[PDB]
From a paper:
Basement membranes are extracellular structures of epithelia and endothelia that have collagen IV scaffolds of triple α-chain helical protomers that associate end-to-end, forming networks. At the C-termini, interactions occur between the trimeric NC1 domains of two protomers, forming a hexamer of these domains reinforced by sulfilimine cross-links. Recent studies in one of our laboratories revealed that the NC1 domains function as recognition modules, directing the selection and assembly of α-chains into protomers and networks.
Since all recombinant proteins used were prepared in NaCl buffers, and since hexamer assembly in the BM from bovine lens has recently been demonstrated to be chloride-dependent, the conformational changes observed in α2NC1homo and α4NC1homo that prevent chloride binding may hinder the final protomer–protomer assembly. Our findings of noncanonical assemblies for α2NC1 and α4NC1 homo-oligomers and the structural changes observed in the chains forming these noncanonical protomers in comparison to α2NC1α121 and to the chains in α1NC1homo, α3NC1homo and α5NC1homo could imply that chain folding is closely related to protomer assembly. It is unlikely that α2NC1homo and α4NC1homo could represent stable physio­logical assemblies, but the structures of the individual chains in these noncanonical oligomers might provide a frozen glimpse of transient conformational states in the process of NC1 folding and hexamer building.
Author numbering:
A (entry chain C), C (entry chain B), D (entry chain D), H (entry chain C): 5 to 195, 213 to 229
B (entry chain F), I (entry chain F): 5 to 195, 214 to 229
E (entry chain E), F (entry chain E): 6 to 195, 214 to 229
G (entry chain A): 4 to 195, 212 to 229
The structure:
């Protein structure tokens, strides 16, 4: 009874590993602006795969007349698909095909990620079954609770596709989402596609 | 299982003890200015080995526009490498080869440090294998939660190399890091003129 | 294992009994001015034996540029050696030979103190080993949590040596320490060596 | 082992049941003026048996220059001996022979009280050892935490001597104590000595 | 485990055969405005108080000793089968109008079953029956242990139907009076009033 | 402008010739632990209370009506020239032992002058004299209107020296007793005790 | 009449008020209450710096602790020293009395100010003003508070008649003790053994318009 | 009875206008880090001219043992003299000759500043007396209380000397001060010394 | 004395009415997101004319390293100039010629605005001199402290030029400013299709 979360980084839903039942499908949510530091926002948690997309994930429900959202915060970040996004900002409707899809599955045991911090793909531990190879992705670099090194352990630190533009911003209070100004953000670097060469590799493993 | 942290005190990653899987590698963070009293800053914890260096570790992520850092506190201290560093306070780019590197490893048991509080090397417990010899380093001397003596039990109270200037300061809101004005700080004195005054220690594990 | 703490009441470090390994050596800290009730200040706890002596044990570290101490209170009490104290208050340097030394050791079991509340030496429980005899010392007399009776069970309530002037005070924000004006403070009386006779006696025991 | 507490209601120290080791001796403290609600003040707890008597039991220690007591609270109540108390108030020194003494012992199991709520002595449960008979005394009658009924379960609800003036009051800030104005206070009544007849009876039992 | 019985008379109830009686008291139903995390169920020992007073919020019943600070004053106690006059009474006059109760050590945890019609619901398969009654549900709000979850408690099953099941006590008035509303807190069906009320049974696995 | 007189007896003082009397009461010296911004000077009307009670902190003297919440209980009243027994008394017994007072409409603001020796200090140049006394300074701390500034008040000049100038009242005890200390609050010089005390005079510009 | 003027003798003798100004009262020179609120001003130019009764606990409303219980943390107090030299050990409320400076408060016809030269010369009083005393510039409140720094210089409190190696003492409240102050020449404003220091200190004068 | 403040921007004290008495002399303090927004830090206020220099202006007094400073803040800024400052940071002692001197004077009326927001020197109002010409300096640009436009009215917005490096930073907790990294900071610009040409001019006037 | 503020709605400073000294010149700030309720953001106040534009007006000064801005709030709205602005959200440098310019002047008396709430130009009071004709603009419509009608008394409720897009938004923590999605906002409707629907006003002073 363990959860494993998969981000396709495309507009297509991923399929769960053979022998793992699909629990639900969603949209890949990376980060919620000004949340509690008491809240973990790892891509490896169920909370990063949301069944319904909306520019206001902070609201309990998506009907303002029933659940009214009080706080100031309306910026949210979502991993992106491989479709290139126009400079002109977009609305809740037109943004959908640019958002990454995801799935959550019932895993026989807890999955962990291993990292080489060089260009080699690190091996899975001795008796474990391998699930995917990736590039190391570490957003939570601050010395917070679960941060830095501890985050590297989660399936959420290993994305399958290297990307110049790994994610997009959503303004809540405005109902808009647009591409991200900075490049190569949060990719963990090593101790043209010459950028891809600078990036740590990883593998996600499970004991079955 | 159990975690074991190594600080090289150099711009070179340490190697994990033969037989212990390496989990990650980073930079040696010693202290974050003014935190929750109960939150612990020991060199023996995984939290002291950060995969990415930045002059602002208080921020959740390293992009200002994504994670805004609200609080006042922006001082951080990092183990310096064996390099001699100039009088000019530097920035997040220049400072990198001056910061100590570190590694975290999965140990088979809980490692502990022993101290002699004199100039002799204290012996490891009866059936315990030895990992390293060092000098006693005790930053947390106040009578806080897990301070003083209880800090001496930690592998983080045993650094391999003595150094006049063991660490450096980083101003967050200034994006700058300089060398530390005071010398021979946090070393635990006895009950190369200084090397003599300093307690000696050893880190052991029951394998 | 468990912890045992010894206060020599002299400027020499005590040796651990019964072949118990010595963890470390320090100075005997009795009490911190205005601590929370949540923080216990017993002479039987490791936190009473500090590796480095400083007129300001409230600071996390002993360099003020690194660790700034924010708050009002800097009165600290340390146990005294047998050396007589001069009238003139003294700074962090000159006080050192006047502070009691201590040691912490890994004990096979939990040490308790027994008290007679008369002039006789009380016996250890049946199958227990005797560690030291002394005088009953009870600072924590208030009806707090861990107070009175409860504090009597601690090894910290049994000082080996009777003393007119058992401890001393340290003004932090003044960086000074001087003898204590009151005499025979905190000793537990019976239900000028005439004073010594009014004092309850105790023994510290462990089950080995 | 568990704690069992005994209040003599005289100036003499009670003796612990045969086979039960005496941990310490003290003075019977019934009630501290306006403590936190989370604070239990049962006569069955160690906290009611204080090794040192003072008119200010709120202060951590008994030397004001070391431990300063900030809160306003200064009244405290102590069980009384059989010796008649004069109408003229008294000081910490002169009040000593009027206060009850008490003992704490290591018991083989948890002691409980059984109450009849009539004039018959209730029996101990089937295989339990009897420790003493008394009169039902229930101070904590309000509907607070471990109050009312819950308190009757305590050995502290069963005092051996019926008394018109069961306790005395101490004003802290004054350093004074005087006999209590009200009579027959806190005795649990039944569903010259016509009063004794109106009182519930109890027995303290332990499983040995 | 504990079992609480409310007689709804001025006589103390007897514990079911086989269960030792721990104590006896007065039936307290509710204390005006207590912190949400505090449960006021008639199946808890806290509902059976050894001494009655118009001020149960005070730690002790001598106010020169225990001073009660907070504003909150009213309390409600189950009433006995006694005609209650119109004059708001005092602590002494009121005693014989209060229900008495008893707490017992039960060999297992007792539960109440409810039919929510006029029939007597059956005890579960190998369970002993303790009493039949009418469904009584004060805690209807969707608070912590509220609504249905309170229905599980033996405290939701009173043996005697009454038009005036309980009374009010003003604390800082030292006064208690009959209650203005009628048929309050009885759980109705999915005296012609007795007919509208759900029936219940309290069972234990012995 | 107001002028307050404390007789230190059980007789009400007379207002100085020419000044209308507004009311009469009992001499309240001090209320245990009140917010710093509240001044307790004997030269303020608040020190002369029309009704005496062992609980002046309550808005009214019927507690079923005005409930007093805060912990603070003790009050001190100037005592009359009456031998006080050792038994702590109640609100009724204590009345004839309390000083009485009167408040008057004065044509100008009265001030007290002090000599801080044994001599009687002279009134300022064209000022009328009202009374001679002994220097009395309770408010010695360096609080708001404290120390010397309190010396300006007519409330710092009592006509009668006394070893026991005042008494204590426990609120939630309904009790008042004589005070343990002696010669308290009298201002000393820069019964052999009367000799040690500074002398004063209360003057007004009429 | 009008305004207050405060005089600190820095001796055990009470000063006399100048120019026939009436004396309102006499007392002891209180310099500073430990960690008072920033909303309370502690200048030696205010009446509150001259206390009629000396106590090692001036935070208390009155000097009988059974009546006025003082609750808060703040303990220490500083009084201006007299000319007589102190011993090394702390002393009690009784012994310390002859070591505390005396003072007086007077009714002035106008508000008195202080002028400073910020060198070794004595600065002149304003044109039509009479001089009241010469001194040495003394500035405790140097922080950038509400009425601090240069603004405190305007106060007659910034001009002490007597230069002193040891201008004040400390009193530990909850200890009931007072002792000599370790530091020397503290709070004197400098110029842009004892004889050397005196030269480095700015001079002042306190003036009033009568 | 009005105050007028003069900053020499040299290590020499300024002289007050003829006919204005000098009240005191000091060091030019521009800004205190993390102060109340309830605190005005204008160069035109008396609070900007401090008689004693120290790296910790936040402390009531300059003896830590008497007035203990509690808050985190130790950065302070001071206008500079014309002496060029070395790259190596300096201490409270050696920094002194680099700090600007100032004076406060008694003015017959309130002085105001006028600004051209171009390269011309603006004239003083019709019957007013001119005191000095300057370059417009506006630090308080935020929409705070006295900020922006309102600050322009104060004598403090008109400095006599244009400067590449108008001020220096002082770290408190470290006891150090060093030159400032940014250039031409806070100079109000217009609607080689080609920088001086871009700067608004001003004049400070008084009604006499 | 009294202050009078003019907004040009162009990249050109307005001129003060003949006879009124100019005190300073700036940029038109309309609104700061989420302030102290009692703090007033009217265009008739000197606080609406800021000498230096920046995308972060909440900060005390415009240097991050000197004045750190702690609070969350970083949205600001500024009167746009008659320029048509592209779909790209711009930065603090690009945005400048798009911001309305303004002037503050010392007026001899208190200026007020009158409104007709129809399409006619309302007349100035009897012996009052006229300053400008405009369109009624009322942002503060909530029943706050000095809102609704009482805002209409202010010279700041009368802008000279009607405009479909009267203002722009600035994200502080993003250092960006873009055009506003909604159109015809804050104009006060009647009791060039839109110009007709809009109340007309005049600003008068008693000189």
């Amino acid at each position: 009874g363990f959860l494993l979360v998969l981000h396709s980084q495309t507009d297509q839903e991923p399929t769960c590993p053979l022998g793992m039942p699909r629990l639900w499908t969603g949209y890949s949510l990376l980060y919620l602006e000004g949340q509690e530091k008491a809240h973990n926002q790892d891509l490896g948690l169920a909370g990063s795969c949301l069944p319904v997309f909306s520019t206001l994930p902070f609201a309990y429900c998506n009907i303002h007349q029933v659940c009214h959202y009080a706080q100031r915060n309306d910026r949210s970040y979502w991993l992106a698909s491989a479709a290139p996004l126009p400079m002109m900002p977009l609305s809740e409707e037109a943004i959908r095909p640019y958002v990454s899809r995801c799935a959550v599955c019932e895993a026989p045991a807890q999955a962990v990620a291993v990292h080489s911090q060089d260009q080699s793909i690190p091996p899975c531990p001795q008796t474990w079954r391998s699930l995917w190879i990736g590039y190391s992705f570490l957003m939570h670099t601050g010395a917070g609770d679960q941060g830095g090194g501890q985050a590297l352990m989660s399936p959420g630190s290993c994305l399958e596709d290297f990307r110049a533009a790994p994610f997009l911003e959503c303004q809540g209070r405005q109902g808009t989402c647009h591409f991200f100004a900075n490049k190569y953000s949060f990719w963990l670097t090593t101790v043209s596609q010459a950028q891809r060469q600078k990036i740590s590799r990883c593998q996600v493993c499970v004991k079955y």
